[PDB]
Enzyme design. Structure first.
Site, PDB file in Angstrom:
ATOM      1  N   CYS D 166      -1.905  -1.795  11.108  1.00 26.65           N
ATOM      2  CA  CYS D 166      -3.121  -2.070  11.839  1.00 26.65           C
ATOM      3  C   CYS D 166      -2.755  -2.816  13.070  1.00 26.65           C
ATOM      4  O   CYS D 166      -3.325  -2.604  14.141  1.00 26.65           O
ATOM      5  CB  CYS D 166      -4.064  -2.889  10.953  1.00 26.65           C
ATOM      6  SG  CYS D 166      -3.445  -4.448  10.383  1.00 26.65           S
ATOM      7  N   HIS D 194      -5.028 -12.861  11.596  1.00 23.52           N
ATOM      8  CA  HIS D 194      -5.176 -11.697  10.769  1.00 23.52           C
ATOM      9  C   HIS D 194      -6.039 -12.032   9.591  1.00 23.52           C
ATOM     10  O   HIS D 194      -5.800 -13.023   8.905  1.00 23.52           O
ATOM     11  CB  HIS D 194      -3.791 -11.320  10.285  1.00 23.52           C
ATOM     12  CG  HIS D 194      -3.663  -9.904   9.847  1.00 23.52           C
ATOM     13  ND1 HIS D 194      -4.198  -9.442   8.660  1.00 23.52           N
ATOM     14  CD2 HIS D 194      -3.022  -8.855  10.414  1.00 23.52           C
ATOM     15  CE1 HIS D 194      -3.897  -8.162   8.517  1.00 23.52           C
ATOM     16  NE2 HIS D 194      -3.193  -7.780   9.574  1.00 23.52           N
ATOM     17  N   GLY D 227       6.398  -7.022  11.168  1.00 27.15           N
ATOM     18  CA  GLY D 227       7.250  -6.078  11.870  1.00 27.15           C
ATOM     19  C   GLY D 227       6.510  -5.401  12.999  1.00 27.15           C
ATOM     20  O   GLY D 227       7.089  -4.606  13.735  1.00 27.15           O
TER      21      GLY D 227
HETATM   22  N1  LIG Z   1      -6.136  -3.394   4.639  1.00 30.00           N
HETATM   23  C1  LIG Z   1      -5.866  -3.230   5.928  1.00 30.00           C
HETATM   24  O1  LIG Z   1      -6.409  -3.855   6.827  1.00 30.00           O
HETATM   25  C2  LIG Z   1      -4.812  -2.182   6.261  1.00 30.00           C
HETATM   26  C3  LIG Z   1      -4.779  -1.613   7.541  1.00 30.00           C
HETATM   27  C4  LIG Z   1      -3.842  -0.664   7.899  1.00 30.00           C
HETATM   28  C5  LIG Z   1      -2.925  -0.265   6.939  1.00 30.00           C
HETATM   29  N2  LIG Z   1      -2.959  -0.803   5.642  1.00 30.00           N
HETATM   30  C6  LIG Z   1      -1.985  -0.364   4.648  1.00 30.00           C
HETATM   31  O2  LIG Z   1      -2.822   0.411   3.840  1.00 30.00           O
HETATM   32  C7  LIG Z   1      -2.211   0.501   2.532  1.00 30.00           C
HETATM   33  C8  LIG Z   1      -3.365   0.161   1.618  1.00 30.00           C
HETATM   34  O3  LIG Z   1      -3.908  -1.082   2.053  1.00 30.00           O
HETATM   35  P1  LIG Z   1      -5.322  -1.540   1.514  1.00 30.00           P
HETATM   36  O4  LIG Z   1      -5.754  -2.699   2.332  1.00 30.00           O
HETATM   37  O5  LIG Z   1      -6.196  -0.358   1.434  1.00 30.00           O
HETATM   38  O6  LIG Z   1      -4.921  -2.038   0.053  1.00 30.00           O
HETATM   39  P2  LIG Z   1      -5.815  -1.791  -1.267  1.00 30.00           P
HETATM   40  O7  LIG Z   1      -5.157  -2.584  -2.332  1.00 30.00           O
HETATM   41  O8  LIG Z   1      -7.229  -2.017  -0.943  1.00 30.00           O
HETATM   42  O9  LIG Z   1      -5.605  -0.212  -1.521  1.00 30.00           O
HETATM   43  C9  LIG Z   1      -4.559   0.281  -2.332  1.00 30.00           C
HETATM   44  C10 LIG Z   1      -5.190   1.165  -3.381  1.00 30.00           C
HETATM   45  O10 LIG Z   1      -4.170   1.924  -4.065  1.00 30.00           O
HETATM   46  C11 LIG Z   1      -4.530   1.942  -5.454  1.00 30.00           C
HETATM   47  N3  LIG Z   1      -3.291   2.306  -6.152  1.00 30.00           N
HETATM   48  C12 LIG Z   1      -2.364   1.452  -6.596  1.00 30.00           C
HETATM   49  N4  LIG Z   1      -1.387   2.149  -7.162  1.00 30.00           N
HETATM   50  C13 LIG Z   1      -1.681   3.448  -7.068  1.00 30.00           C
HETATM   51  C14 LIG Z   1      -1.045   4.623  -7.465  1.00 30.00           C
HETATM   52  N5  LIG Z   1       0.131   4.571  -8.093  1.00 30.00           N
HETATM   53  N6  LIG Z   1      -1.628   5.810  -7.196  1.00 30.00           N
HETATM   54  C15 LIG Z   1      -2.798   5.873  -6.563  1.00 30.00           C
HETATM   55  N7  LIG Z   1      -3.425   4.771  -6.181  1.00 30.00           N
HETATM   56  C16 LIG Z   1      -2.898   3.548  -6.415  1.00 30.00           C
HETATM   57  C17 LIG Z   1      -5.024   0.509  -5.683  1.00 30.00           C
HETATM   58  O11 LIG Z   1      -5.895   0.428  -6.820  1.00 30.00           O
HETATM   59  C18 LIG Z   1      -5.843   0.268  -4.423  1.00 30.00           C
HETATM   60  O12 LIG Z   1      -7.179   0.724  -4.611  1.00 30.00           O
HETATM   61  C19 LIG Z   1      -1.147  -0.578   2.476  1.00 30.00           C
HETATM   62  O13 LIG Z   1       0.137   0.093   2.553  1.00 30.00           O
HETATM   63  C20 LIG Z   1      -1.509  -1.439   3.697  1.00 30.00           C
HETATM   64  O14 LIG Z   1      -0.402  -2.095   4.292  1.00 30.00           O
HETATM   65  C21 LIG Z   1      -3.910  -1.772   5.297  1.00 30.00           C
END
Ligand SMILES: NC(=O)c1ccc[n+]([C@@H]2O[C@H](COP(=O)([O-])OP(=O)(O)OC[C@H]3O[C@@H](n4cnc5c(N)ncnc54)[C@H](O)[C@@H]3O)[C@@H](O)[C@H]2O)c1
Ligand SMILES: NC(=O)c1ccc[n+]([C@@H]2O[C@H](COP(=O)([O-])OP(=O)(O)OC[C@H]3O[C@@H](n4cnc5c(N)ncnc54)[C@H](O)[C@@H]3O)[C@@H](O)[C@H]2O)c1
Ligand SMILES: NC(=O)c1ccc[n+]([C@@H]2O[C@H](COP(=O)([O-])OP(=O)(O)OC[C@H]3O[C@@H](n4cnc5c(N)ncnc54)[C@H](O)[C@@H]3O)[C@@H](O)[C@H]2O)c1
Ligand SMILES: NC(=O)c1ccc[n+]([C@@H]2O[C@H](COP(=O)([O-])OP(=O)(O)OC[C@H]3O[C@@H](n4cnc5c(N)ncnc54)[C@H](O)[C@@H]3O)[C@@H](O)[C@H]2O)c1
Lengths: 359, 359, 359, 359
Positions: D166, D194, D227
């Site tokens: 993000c 953040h 990073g």
């Molecule tokens: N949250 C943010 O602001 C943001 C923004 C950009 C990128 N990201 C990246 O997005 C990815 C998810 O972040 P998030 O904030 O949505 O986290 P989150 O924990 O809300 O979403 C992860 C989801 O994956 C599910 N999950 C876990 N193991 C799994 C599996 N083996 N198979 C399928 N589903 C599974 C979890 O229950 C959870 O609902 C991360 O890699 C994060 O760095 C997050």
């Protein structure tokens, strides 16, 4: 000999200054706090406010209340550790506080209302000899930062002084070491990630002179200008026009961090800067500048009495490898506590110097 | 003709009242907001405040500004979907508001400061014929809650009315259903878990008439007396003396919940109350009492315009099994939003009964 | 003869229990904590966690680390006040913990995962003699609440036992005084305004067992069922079937408050009840039930080591005038700290009765 | 032919990606969301999660559930305006996802767990053709930032890609404008303020790999490495080795801000930078970079579809007057919402280029 102090504005700082003034064991011996003043004269309310602090917890000292004389309506006098502090009535005008009659020579001006030096000399009109504004002043008040320039305190010349801001008190020590160590500062921009404060708003309210600061404080990152880094250029004159910065006010009630990005005047390394800061902190910056090499978050700096707590790990980990000039320094501060301790240090430093210059 | 309204005190309630009548598609057509009022006349600041809301998001309508007279220094007029709203100067006394010249018949008293009926009678001396106090009113102002007693409004005797509190607006509809559906209330205690509000403090500050209320709002559970439950005894007089309760102010900026515990006037069950509450919400309490049977939390009631959103799952899961008399009902409210809509509802109902008169 | 203890699960309660027993000067004096266990055995990490607490500040004792064997790579041993605590590797199954090899006779089971009696009994098979489950237990673990029924502990019969929940340790003392003092509880409904906890989520997240509880914890009021009031029934047998309740999890990291609405089994008054709880407090509930008559908010109860701190003002101010049967009682608890002290209290009681039992 | 998409990890990004899809009217036309996968197949719970969002409000679109077949015990299929989405069970290994069977061609990898290219390639074994990792990827996944380097996408070459963080999505567009326009970046250090995220803890918890990130998220400022600024050097290779930065995780559940401090590669002024960012935002960076010149706080960027919303006032007000090289750029971003839109755009771009290659 006990120095006679008065605290005008018994809030976060007016009261942490007091707690700081007690924590150091100074109440009644080295310092007689003759009178504290807020809105009311309600010693019971004052005492309640002292006893309990959301961030700083329970006041180590027993606070009792009494009356100045039976012909008073409610307890108008705090009793801290046997010592008696009169609750005087607030004044729209500092000139109307009865400092001379009280025998208060040092006024800590912590209302946030009398940062204009002209206003803050009101106390000297009421009988005081010195005022220390618990904020940046305006109108030529000598600004003093403990551990940086506080020895430029001229008893014969400086009567209404500013202790700068909490942020300047965090930044200036960092910049002072940079300067003193010979890294130098071409330019710098600092951001403080800042806990919200008394002037901010629970929910979106009116803040005509700062629209963002009117926004719900505990649910927003709220940008703000700050004169803290510019103010350093007045405390460390060789950095004038070389530093500015801003604030983001964030949903924490206390504790802040300086994020200083600066360019050094000659080649160095973040390692050298980090070694300097750590040595400075151990030595000529002792008690003012600290450091941690631990994985601390803001809560860990609650009740830290240093004005600046250099975060070594955050600094070392978040700089450019092999970089010679362009650096980020992270330093923390309990904006309430560190600063309030500095006010006392300042007051005390001024009193020793006022002693020296008299006898 | 156009319903001529003026809002005295443009804050959370002043603005949301405005945002509610706009959103109900009333601005210009059903309702002419002639003037608003706050500290400054800075329409540009009002516009920003209306445009952006930490809890309620961006205003769905474009807000521009203009001068009423080309003679004025800064824009003092709001334009909302082509409707002009003058920003008039704040008074320390409602009597000095120019509702006469302005043509304002209905005043919404949302400053928080003229809840004393007599005080609020100023708008009348200023030119207005009606005043809706957006808070509990002291001084024998007729308290009305939409969906509960709003039909008790009498054009000839009621000119300064209270819309009660947001909490009473949550509670009274529950209690009304309880009473009207035959369950009755013998006695009841209510606790509202309440979002913090404007009168609260970001950090421990002076609050002499409410010591707990002075404490940092967003890091504390802060107990408080509330008049809300007693106030239901005005709105549903059969319950006079039968109800009281308290508030816990918690670290959310909006949305509250009534947790009412009561003893029915006959043997019943929670399932009976549940079904009644759902019935009433579909029928005679439509728009005022809502209900959910989903796993909702405070955020999910943001921008809900009902006064009371009964929590079916929280109620049904947290009552004593087989209990006949002693029940807890859980009902939510967006204390800013529902109430604001009710204020608009009240004015809309006053206007209809002021007109058609008497026909 | 020092009590040999191991703590299984070194999180909020694991550490606070350890800090509680250190605070009470019990470490290496009255209690030998032989081993603590969590997801790691990095003593340096354990030390950091003990050392810095967001809520509870800095640990009053220095923690150092050292190596059980000079070869063992990363430090695996905590040192507090000369006392060596091994960080043993967590097991998915308690019977695999080397308790018999460590000489641990009392396990504090604080993982949250071995709350079923049969699961916690694994500890016994791992060689331990007694288990205090730091939560309600299923499968018929004896529930003991210090100051209420801990004297029901039967060394020969009770080997796996529960200290109930923080909420039950808060409510039981109140209900206990009500029953003991001859007020009686006909019916009781409780709400606890609860701080969020480790099981909650920072952002809306998956929580299959608790949909609400998956919602962003620090920005929401989140209803929950609780077995806390229902569980007072096994601790105070006369209250079985008479009491239930719920929680609203609100955005504070620690400290909660019991809001109990009950009907007395005889005519009484809130003044009687108030006075009775104060008396109990000063006497047979000393250290368990506390009270305040100050204007306290939740932060003021941080590090309160009582189970229940009765809120006199909030109770006195928020009950029906002249009411004889239907009452609300407000009692705070630091859900982390008070409970942790009780865990230690219980182990100590158990250890005292275990010693006595056979000689 | 709509592209067949699977969302692996239906969390904050998984779900906001889905909202971006429906909101933009892409479901069933450009993109078929064939399956979403999380911890179960309980569509009812999936629908509750999609339906209610603490930060983003109630889903505007109705979500219903059915069974894929009558054999299924519970609903496993979401229905969003006619569009059917199978809830598939989480696999510890993407290679076991039934992508091939499902006809899923593009997998949005948003678990946070298959961020290693080799692990994400599991989806390719699973039958997918393309993976968009919704985070920085390790192991050589091409990183693509919409509006910056996304045209570098090579169908024959890039099968598992990263849409970056993000934060990089906030930073890269600013840096891109600075480089494209010839301001240049000699050195840069950014800080991001953040919002806390799902990896953070409500209360001090265990986080062996990020000690500070273990600390209570919503009551602390929590420094962190990132990073993000370094990653710009993969996306804008001319800036390799020239940018790093850090994060302060602060108590907001959504919306973040980049605080970029850099030296330009030629003499400029912040007015010129400012001018250039605005001009780019209206032109070649439209939809990716936005700007505000309003007095915005983080709440105001909630639901902003841009990667980077340049804060013109915070920037312009907080720079060195007459400065030629050394500047601060403040840019906001809804870390969840902007980014999720970016994910969608990426897949759509990849799809575009895959159709044009494989013809
Ligand atoms: N949250 C943010 O602001 C943001 C923004 C950009 C990128 N990201 C990246 O997005 C990815 C998810 O972040 P998030 O904030 O949505 O986290 P989150 O924990 O809300 O979403 C992860 C989801 O994956 C599910 N999950 C876990 N193991 C799994 C599996 N083996 N198979 C399928 N589903 C599974 C979890 O229950 C959870 O609902 C991360 O890699 C994060 O760095 C997050
Ligand atoms: N709080 C911090 O973190 C911090 C740090 C450094 C400097 N400062 C500066 O300290 C000053 C006060 O800060 P604070 O945070 O303690 O705010 P505060 O509002 O908590 O303290 C001010 C107190 O003065 C009282 N007061 C108002 N008018 C008065 C009058 N006429 N006479 C006497 N008392 C009056 C108020 O009731 C309040 O209790 C401000 O200038 C602020 O910028 C604050
Ligand atoms: N906010 C809620 O949740 C809520 C709900 C129901 C009822 N109420 C009642 O509504 C009233 C206002 O509530 P609020 O939340 O909007 O508070 P607020 O402080 O947000 O709004 C009041 C506004 O009045 C303005 N004001 C103050 N003095 C004035 C004057 N003399 N003339 C004109 N304007 C003046 C202030 O600038 C402020 O913007 C209170 O009586 C409150 O009890 C509030
Ligand atoms: N937190 C409170 O306010 C409170 C109060 C009373 C009772 N409790 C109960 O205490 C128990 C612990 O709760 P908490 O708040 O400390 O949660 P927590 O998550 O902070 O602590 C649990 C610790 O156990 C560790 N753990 C998990 N599995 C383990 C295993 N197999 N072996 C060893 N350690 C393991 C976790 O890493 C964590 O550090 C729960 O049953 C909770 O209900 C909590």
């Amino acid at each position: 000999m006990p120095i006679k102090v008065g605290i005008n504005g018994f809030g976060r700082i007016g009261r942490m200054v007091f707690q700081a003034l007690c924590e150091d064991g100074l109440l009644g011996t080295e310092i007689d706090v003759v009178a504290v003043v807020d809105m009311n004269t309600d010693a019971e309310y004052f005492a309640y406010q002292m006893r309990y602090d959301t961030v700083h917890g329970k006041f180590k000292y027993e606070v009792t209340t009494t009356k100045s004389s039976p012909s008073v309506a409610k307890d108008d006098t705090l009793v801290v550790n046997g010592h008696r502090i009169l609750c005087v009535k607030a004044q729209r005008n500092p000139a109307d506080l009865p400092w001379g009659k009280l025998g208060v020579e040092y006024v800590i001006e912590s209302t946030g209302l009398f940062t204009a030096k002209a206003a803050a000399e009101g106390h000297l009109r009421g009988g005081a000899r010195k005022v220390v504004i618990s904020a940046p002043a305006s109108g030529g008040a000598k600004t003093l930062v403990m551990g940086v320039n506080h020895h430029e305190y001229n008893p014969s010349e400086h009567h209404v002084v500013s202790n700068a801001s909490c942020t300047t008190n965090c930044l200036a020590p960092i910049v002072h070491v940079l300067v003193k160590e010979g890294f130098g500062v071409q330019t710098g921009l600092m951001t403080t990630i800042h806990s919200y404060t008394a002037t901010q708003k629970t929910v979106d309210g009116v803040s005509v002179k700062d629209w963002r600061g009117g926004r719900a404080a505990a649910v927003n990152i709220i940008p703000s200008t700050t004169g803290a880094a510019k103010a350093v250029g007045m405390v460390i004159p060789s950095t004038q026009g070389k530093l500015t910065g801003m604030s983001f006010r964030v949903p924490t009630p206390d504790v802040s961090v300086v994020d200083l990005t600066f360019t050094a005047a000659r080649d160095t390394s973040i390692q050298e800067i980090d070694a300097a800061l750590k040595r400075a902190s151990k030595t000529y910056m002792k008690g003012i500048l600290g450091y941690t090499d631990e994985e601390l978050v803001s809560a860990d700096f609650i009740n830290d009495n240093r004005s600046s707590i250099y975060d070594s790990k955050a600094t070392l980990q978040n700089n450019l490898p092999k970089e010679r000039r362009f650096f980020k320094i992270v330093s923390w501060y309990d904006n309430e506590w560190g600063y309030s301790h500095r006010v006392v240090d300042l007051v005390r430093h001024m009193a020793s110097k006022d002693r020296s210059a008299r006898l």
